[PDB]
């Protein structure tokens, strides 16, 4: 079973990357299973703003590692980030501000959930899907 761990926001970089204090040390996290537009790509600024707003206004930030590899080649943690219980990864996808990325090294626990939301956002021709 996956476990949520508290973190404290340090700095939101862009749509899919956040800087957090995790276990008494700063660390950069790359949001699992999502590909947001890079800031400046169409919708890049919107995905960045959405992620920033979501994590700054949160009272509680939690990180949840998946069952596969926990860090990428650049040393970024790979996790699902929760802001007051709401998963940022899913929130971005549901809003049409990101696409579900290909599974990476066995980290696929929430792939189905995100695929459903993406289908719906696409069905609503939201943002990236307009």
From Swiss-Prot:
Ca(2+) binds at residues 16, 35-36. It is found in: Secreted. Residues 110-130 are annotated as: Disordered. The active site is at 30, 38, 76. Coiled coil: none annotated. Residues 110-126 have a biased composition (Basic and acidic residues). This is Nuclease A. The gene is nuc. The chain holds residues 88 to 223 of 231 of the full protein.
């Amino acid at each position: 079973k996956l476990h949520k761990e508290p973190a404290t926001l340090i700095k939101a970089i862009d749509g899919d990357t956040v800087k957090l204090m995790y276990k008494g040390q700063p660390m950069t996290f790359r949001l699992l299973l999502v590909d947001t537009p890079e800031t400046v790509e169409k919708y890049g600024p919107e995905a960045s703003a959405f992620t920033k707003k979501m994590v700054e206004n949160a009272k509680k930030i939690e990180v949840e590692f998946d069952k596969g590899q926990r860090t990428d080649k650049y040393g970024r943690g790979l996790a699902y980030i929760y802001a007051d219980g709401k998963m940022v990864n899913e929130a971005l996808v549901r809003q049409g501000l990101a696409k579900v990325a290909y599974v990476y090294k066995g980290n696929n626990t929430h792939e189905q959930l995100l695929r459903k939301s993406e289908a719906q956002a696409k069905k609503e021709k939201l943002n990236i899907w307009s």
